[PDB]
Every structure is written in structure tokens, then in C-alpha cells.
Design an enzyme around this catalytic site. Structure first.
Site, PDB file in Angstrom:
ATOM      1  N   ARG A  51       7.637  -6.522  -7.718  1.00  0.00           N
ATOM      2  CA  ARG A  51       6.927  -6.942  -6.515  1.00  0.00           C
ATOM      3  C   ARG A  51       7.603  -6.349  -5.286  1.00  0.00           C
ATOM      4  O   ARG A  51       8.812  -6.503  -5.102  1.00  0.00           O
ATOM      5  CB  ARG A  51       6.921  -8.474  -6.410  1.00  0.00           C
ATOM      6  CG  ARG A  51       6.170  -9.030  -5.197  1.00  0.00           C
ATOM      7  CD  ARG A  51       4.677  -8.728  -5.258  1.00  0.00           C
ATOM      8  NE  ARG A  51       3.943  -9.331  -4.143  1.00  0.00           N
ATOM      9  CZ  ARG A  51       3.489 -10.583  -4.124  1.00  0.00           C
ATOM     10  NH1 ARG A  51       3.686 -11.387  -5.162  1.00  0.00           N
ATOM     11  NH2 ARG A  51       2.823 -11.030  -3.071  1.00  0.00           N
ATOM     12  N   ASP A  91       5.810 -16.190   1.133  1.00  0.00           N
ATOM     13  CA  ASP A  91       5.174 -17.478   0.896  1.00  0.00           C
ATOM     14  C   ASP A  91       5.462 -18.435   2.033  1.00  0.00           C
ATOM     15  O   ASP A  91       6.612 -18.567   2.454  1.00  0.00           O
ATOM     16  CB  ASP A  91       5.653 -18.083  -0.421  1.00  0.00           C
ATOM     17  CG  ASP A  91       5.217 -17.283  -1.623  1.00  0.00           C
ATOM     18  OD1 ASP A  91       4.336 -16.402  -1.468  1.00  0.00           O
ATOM     19  OD2 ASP A  91       5.748 -17.554  -2.727  1.00  0.00           O
ATOM     20  N   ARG A 127       0.833  -1.206   0.000  1.00  0.00           N
ATOM     21  CA  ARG A 127       0.000   0.000   0.000  1.00  0.00           C
ATOM     22  C   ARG A 127       0.869   1.259   0.000  1.00  0.00           C
ATOM     23  O   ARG A 127       0.621   2.198  -0.757  1.00  0.00           O
ATOM     24  CB  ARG A 127      -0.895   0.036   1.239  1.00  0.00           C
ATOM     25  CG  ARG A 127      -1.924  -1.076   1.338  1.00  0.00           C
ATOM     26  CD  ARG A 127      -3.065  -0.876   0.369  1.00  0.00           C
ATOM     27  NE  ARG A 127      -4.209  -1.708   0.727  1.00  0.00           N
ATOM     28  CZ  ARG A 127      -5.385  -1.665   0.111  1.00  0.00           C
ATOM     29  NH1 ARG A 127      -5.576  -0.828  -0.901  1.00  0.00           N
ATOM     30  NH2 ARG A 127      -6.373  -2.457   0.507  1.00  0.00           N
ATOM     31  N   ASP A 166       6.795 -10.340  -1.186  1.00  0.00           N
ATOM     32  CA  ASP A 166       5.995 -11.540  -1.338  1.00  0.00           C
ATOM     33  C   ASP A 166       6.434 -12.527  -0.254  1.00  0.00           C
ATOM     34  O   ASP A 166       7.600 -12.912  -0.196  1.00  0.00           O
ATOM     35  CB  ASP A 166       6.204 -12.132  -2.740  1.00  0.00           C
ATOM     36  CG  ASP A 166       5.474 -13.448  -2.934  1.00  0.00           C
ATOM     37  OD1 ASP A 166       4.280 -13.517  -2.573  1.00  0.00           O
ATOM     38  OD2 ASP A 166       6.099 -14.401  -3.453  1.00  0.00           O
TER      39      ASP A 166
HETATM   40  N1  LIG Z   1       1.949 -21.462   0.999  1.00  0.00           N
HETATM   41  C1  LIG Z   1       1.311 -20.368   0.662  1.00  0.00           C
HETATM   42  N2  LIG Z   1       1.897 -19.180   1.157  1.00  0.00           N
HETATM   43  C2  LIG Z   1       1.347 -18.025   0.883  1.00  0.00           C
HETATM   44  N3  LIG Z   1       0.179 -17.764   0.113  1.00  0.00           N
HETATM   45  C3  LIG Z   1      -0.370 -18.965  -0.359  1.00  0.00           C
HETATM   46  C4  LIG Z   1       0.157 -20.223  -0.105  1.00  0.00           C
HETATM   47  N4  LIG Z   1      -0.637 -21.224  -0.726  1.00  0.00           N
HETATM   48  C5  LIG Z   1      -1.634 -20.570  -1.352  1.00  0.00           C
HETATM   49  N5  LIG Z   1      -1.470 -19.147  -1.128  1.00  0.00           N
HETATM   50  C6  LIG Z   1      -2.445 -18.195  -1.723  1.00  0.00           C
HETATM   51  O1  LIG Z   1      -1.763 -17.474  -2.804  1.00  0.00           O
HETATM   52  C7  LIG Z   1      -2.609 -16.312  -2.965  1.00  0.00           C
HETATM   53  C8  LIG Z   1      -1.986 -15.306  -3.886  1.00  0.00           C
HETATM   54  O2  LIG Z   1      -0.667 -14.959  -3.294  1.00  0.00           O
HETATM   55  P1  LIG Z   1       0.430 -14.251  -4.223  1.00  0.00           P
HETATM   56  O3  LIG Z   1       1.558 -13.806  -3.287  1.00  0.00           O
HETATM   57  O4  LIG Z   1      -0.237 -13.149  -4.975  1.00  0.00           O
HETATM   58  C9  LIG Z   1       1.022 -15.503  -5.337  1.00  0.00           C
HETATM   59  P2  LIG Z   1       2.777 -15.321  -5.680  1.00  0.00           P
HETATM   60  O5  LIG Z   1       3.544 -15.631  -4.394  1.00  0.00           O
HETATM   61  O6  LIG Z   1       2.952 -13.978  -6.304  1.00  0.00           O
HETATM   62  O7  LIG Z   1       3.168 -16.476  -6.739  1.00  0.00           O
HETATM   63  P3  LIG Z   1       3.659 -17.996  -6.434  1.00  0.00           P
HETATM   64  O8  LIG Z   1       2.606 -18.706  -5.663  1.00  0.00           O
HETATM   65  O9  LIG Z   1       3.911 -18.606  -7.786  1.00  0.00           O
HETATM   66  O10 LIG Z   1       4.970 -17.905  -5.683  1.00  0.00           O
HETATM   67  C10 LIG Z   1      -2.908 -15.829  -1.592  1.00  0.00           C
HETATM   68  O11 LIG Z   1      -3.979 -14.975  -1.465  1.00  0.00           O
HETATM   69  C11 LIG Z   1      -2.991 -17.093  -0.810  1.00  0.00           C
HETATM   70  O12 LIG Z   1      -4.354 -17.369  -0.433  1.00  0.00           O
HETATM   71  N1  LIG Z   2      13.769 -15.321  -8.692  1.00  0.00           N
HETATM   72  C1  LIG Z   2      12.546 -15.303  -8.459  1.00  0.00           C
HETATM   73  N2  LIG Z   2      11.544 -15.359  -9.253  1.00  0.00           N
HETATM   74  C2  LIG Z   2      10.262 -15.336  -8.940  1.00  0.00           C
HETATM   75  C3  LIG Z   2       9.877 -15.231  -7.475  1.00  0.00           C
HETATM   76  C4  LIG Z   2      10.908 -15.166  -6.581  1.00  0.00           C
HETATM   77  O1  LIG Z   2      10.768 -15.074  -5.311  1.00  0.00           O
HETATM   78  N3  LIG Z   2      12.181 -15.200  -7.032  1.00  0.00           N
HETATM   79  N4  LIG Z   2       8.554 -15.203  -7.126  1.00  0.00           N
HETATM   80  C5  LIG Z   2       7.594 -15.263  -8.013  1.00  0.00           C
HETATM   81  C6  LIG Z   2       6.148 -15.216  -7.604  1.00  0.00           C
HETATM   82  O2  LIG Z   2       5.897 -15.094  -6.265  1.00  0.00           O
HETATM   83  C7  LIG Z   2       7.897 -15.374  -9.544  1.00  0.00           C
HETATM   84  N5  LIG Z   2       9.215 -15.391  -9.753  1.00  0.00           N
HETATM   85 MG   LIG Z   3       5.701 -16.330  -4.420  1.00  0.00          MG
HETATM   86 MG   LIG Z   4       2.974 -15.144  -2.360  1.00  0.00          MG
END
Ligand SMILES: Nc1ncnc2c1ncn2[C@@H]1O[C@H](COP(=O)(O)CP(=O)(O)OP(=O)(O)O)[C@@H](O)[C@H]1O
Ligand SMILES: Nc1nc2c(c(=O)[nH]1)N=C(CO)CN2
Ligand SMILES: [Mg+2]
Ligand SMILES: [Mg+2]
Ligand SMILES: Nc1ncnc2c1ncn2[C@@H]1O[C@H](COP(=O)(O)CP(=O)(O)OP(=O)(O)O)[C@@H](O)[C@H]1O
Ligand SMILES: Nc1nc2c(c(=O)[nH]1)N=C(CO)CN2
Ligand SMILES: [Mg+2]
Ligand SMILES: [Mg+2]
Lengths: 159, 159
Positions: free
Chosen positions: A93, A98, A83, A96
Site C-alpha cells: 500500500r 484513515d 496514481r 492509506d
Molecule cells: N474513518 C474512515 N477514514 C477513512 N476512510 C473511511 C473511514 N470510514 C469509512 N471509510 C471508507 O473506507 C473506504 C475504503 O478505504 P480504504 O483505505 O481502501 C480501507 P483500508 O484503510 O485499506 O482498510 P481498513 O479500513 O481496515 O483500515 C473509503 O472509500 C471510505 O469511504
Molecule cells: N501494521 C499494519 N497493518 C495493517 C495496516 C496498517 O496501517 N498497519 N492497515 C491495514 C489496512 O488499511 C491492514 N493492515
Molecule cells: Mg486503513
Molecule cells: Mg483507509
């Protein structure tokens, strides 16, 4: 508490600040404890689009928060940082987060899939993970060290 | 050609535009043919954040494009529609295209996980899917009809 591994990623021109603030935000999560931080890595972004390199790191945290509460919290962090920069979806990005692993559990809901679907194919997740958890064995039985032999650094270097 | 199912979603104030443009863009994809469209549905957005309801639909198409190429094309469509609006990541979603199923294959790569991880728990993907493929059987052997017994409409209604 449950041992959790979170992947931090940012490919802004100057991603350092994002990742540092995130590590801070994570260490202060309710009923959670930061346990270890991996080194910071410069990696190549996935996808045909040409964009800035990524800054990737992995953090180990112990938590009492259930998967969904943990997700609400990590997304809150992403959201706050995004934001502030009026982050555009189709561009660099900001941050992010995960959830790579949640204990030795397999989580599958409308909002989650843990282990992260791409963990075993992403060097930017596996290598940093191996730095802080070399003897780790995934929920499906395959050990991290075995995965590493299958996944190349793919251009991954120290930031 | 391989039978693919794509989930279309948008929760902008005026989402009809996005979904319609997407259905046409999909129909004109290289070495691909639109086969069928599901009805349009108004569904409740996932997550704690408060935002507009979603407009969801499912499209069936036959394609010769491999998973990676298909994904490059769907993302291209999302990007084209989102860029024009300078779409904010943490605001309403312009257009989200999730590859739900690809033939009867299980695809797991650094960029893909098919079947979509949330397919079996998302009413907004399952119900529209059942409208155009009622006798479908997932790669794991479970039928869509049996899966439907476990997932509630969760407030899902026609748009
Ligand atoms: N292990 C996990 N960690 C985080 N988010 C997760 C997840 N498994 C599913 N998600 C879901 O992924 C949705 C979208 O998250 P984003 O961060 O936009 C995807 P991204 O991380 O950009 O790509 P990627 O999943 O290919 O790495 C979230 O709203 C969430 O509900
Ligand atoms: N090197 C690299 N590439 C990406 C990454 C990331 O963390 N590292 N995350 C993504 C979507 O979440 C898509 N691509
Ligand atoms: Mg990701
Ligand atoms: Mg994510
Ligand atoms: N079946 C699939 N269909 C589409 N994208 C997929 C996919 N499996 C993995 N992805 C990956 O998901 C990444 C992020 O896509 P996003 O559209 O931002 C997630 P979302 O669809 O908003 O959340 P969701 O996965 O919880 O539905 C893509 O860059 C793509 O590589
Ligand atoms: N109702 C509804 N909720 C969602 C949807 C969606 O298509 N419909 N897509 C999401 C992420 O892609 C998150 N939440
Ligand atoms: Mg998507
Ligand atoms: Mg989606």
C-alpha cells in the site's frame, strides 16, 4: 475548529517518502491546521498474506472541514500518491489515510464510520495516538490509557 | 451453521463476469452452503470521482467458518480475481466482497466490523438484502423493513 486524528500508513519497501509527503499534504489542507505529529513506527501487517512491514504514524489536525469534505481531501492525497506509482490494489500500500477521530463525534454514513472501526484494536493506531494525546477519552467513554492496557504493542517498534 | 450475508460489488466495464465467478466461488467455500441469491442491480458509485456504475448483489450462505476464516476466504476470492487483472487501486473495482451480517452477532476486531458499517445507509446493500430476507431484524433490534423507509433507491435499478 474541530480536532481530528488521522492515521497514516504505508508498507512499500521505502515508505518514508510517502508518509512525509502525506504529512505535508495534510498540513496544507483548506481551513485546517497541523497541530502535532507522532513518532514513526514499524509495525506488523494484518492479514495472512506475507508483505512488507508497515510504516505507521498519527497526526493531529484542527479543521473546519466537515467529515465528507475532509474525506474527499484525504482520499485525494491517497489518490495522487497512488496514481504516481500506478498502485496495484493487491500489493504493498502506497499511502492509506484513515480518519481515526473527528472531534468527540460519532459519524456514520454511506462513506464513513468514525471512530475508525478498528481503532480500539490496532496498536499501530493507539500507541502513536497516545504519544500525542495521552489523556484522550473516546466518544464512547473509554479512555485511551485503558485501551492501551488491553492492546499489546504486537511487535510495534520505532521505525 | 451461521447465516451470513455477503455484498458483492464490481464497477468494471464488464462486471457480470466478476459477480458470477464470485457467486460460484462462494458456493464452494469450505464448510459453507449457498442459500440464496438476490437479483442483480445497477447502482450509482459513491464518492466525488467519476467512474462506471456498480453491479451489486447480495448472497446468503450458511457457514461453520468463524469470522476471521470467512474473511480470509472472501479476500482470497477478491485477490484471485483482481491479481489476474493487475487491478489498479484507484481505478474500477474488480470484485469487492463485504461481510454484511454474521448471524445476529456484532463482530469488532482489528480486521473486522460486522454489521458492515455502511449497511444501514447503502441502498445497494439494503434493497438486495430485503429481496432475500424481507423480515430480517438487525442485531440492534431495528427491522430491515423500517430501515428501508429511511433509505432511498438512490438511482438503483435492475442491471
Ligand atoms: N474513518 C474512515 N477514514 C477513512 N476512510 C473511511 C473511514 N470510514 C469509512 N471509510 C471508507 O473506507 C473506504 C475504503 O478505504 P480504504 O483505505 O481502501 C480501507 P483500508 O484503510 O485499506 O482498510 P481498513 O479500513 O481496515 O483500515 C473509503 O472509500 C471510505 O469511504
Ligand atoms: N501494521 C499494519 N497493518 C495493517 C495496516 C496498517 O496501517 N498497519 N492497515 C491495514 C489496512 O488499511 C491492514 N493492515
Ligand atoms: Mg486503513
Ligand atoms: Mg483507509
Ligand atoms: N464486514 C467486513 N467485510 C469485509 N471486509 C471488512 C469488513 N469489516 C472490515 N473489513 C476490512 O476492510 C478492509 C479493506 O477492505 P476493502 O474491500 O478494501 C474496503 P471497501 O469494501 O472497498 O470499502 P467500504 O468498506 O467502504 O465498502 C479489509 O482488509 C478488511 O479487514
Ligand atoms: N454503488 C456503489 N458504490 C460504491 C460501492 C458499491 O458496492 N456500490 N462500494 C464501495 C466501496 O466498497 C464505494 N462505493
Ligand atoms: Mg470490501
Ligand atoms: Mg465495500
Amino acid at each position: 475548529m474541530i480536532r481530528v486524528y488521522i492515521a497514516l500508513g504505508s508498507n512499500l519497501a521505502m515508505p518514508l517518502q510517502q508518509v512525509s509527503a502525506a504529512r505535508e499534504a495534510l498540513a496544507h489542507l483548506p481551513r485546517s491546521r497541523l497541530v502535532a505529529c507522532s513518532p514513526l513506527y514499524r509495525t506488523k501487517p494484518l492479514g495472512p498474506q506475507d508483505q512488507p512491514d508497515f510504516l505507521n504514524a498519527v497526526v493531529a489536525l484542527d479543521t473546519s472541514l466537515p467529515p465528507e469534505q475532509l474525506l474527499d481531501h484525504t482520499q485525494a492525497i491517497e489518490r495522487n500518491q497512488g496514481r504516481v506509482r500506478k498502485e496495484q490494489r493487491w500489493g504493498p500500500r502506497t499511502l492509506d489515510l484513515d480518519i481515526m477521530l473527528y472531534g468527540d463525534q460519532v459519524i456514520k454514513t454511506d462513506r464513513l464510520t468514525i471512530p475508525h472501526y478498528g481503532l480500539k484494536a490496532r496498536e499501530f493506531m493507539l500507541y502513536p495516538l497516545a504519544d500525542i494525546a495521552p489523556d484522550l477519552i473516546f466518544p464512547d467513554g473509554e479512555s485511551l490509557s485503558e485501551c492501551l492496557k488491553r492492546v499489546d504493542k504486537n511487535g510495534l517498534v520505532l521505525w
